[PDB]
Amino acid sequence: NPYFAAGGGLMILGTGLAVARSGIIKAS
Amino acid sequence: NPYFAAGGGLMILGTGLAVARSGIIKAS
């Protein structure tokens, strides 16, 4: 469990990267 | 966590590879 509790964090930060890549485009 | 902190780095460098493959085409 704790060794693979990092996959969820990587998914979270990847969704954050996708949200930021969407937001930068939606501003310019 | 630290053993699987490399998946995020591989995703980062893969996004960089995709960005470079897009940029080389968008120049020529």
From Swiss-Prot, chains A, B:
Subcellular compartments: Mitochondrion inner membrane
Superkingdom assignment: Eukaryota
Entry's transmembrane regions: 1-20
Family affiliation: Belongs to the AAA ATPase family. BCS1 subfamily.
Annotated function: Chaperone necessary for the incorporation of Rieske iron-sulfur protein RIP1 into the mitochondrial respiratory chain complex III.
Miscellaneous: Present with 1990 molecules/cell in log phase SD medium.
Protein name: Mitochondrial chaperone BCS1
Species per Swiss-Prot/TrEMBL record: Saccharomyces cerevisiae (strain ATCC 204508 / S288c) (Baker's yeast)
Taxonomic lineage of the native organism: Eukaryota, Fungi, Dikarya, Ascomycota, Saccharomycotina
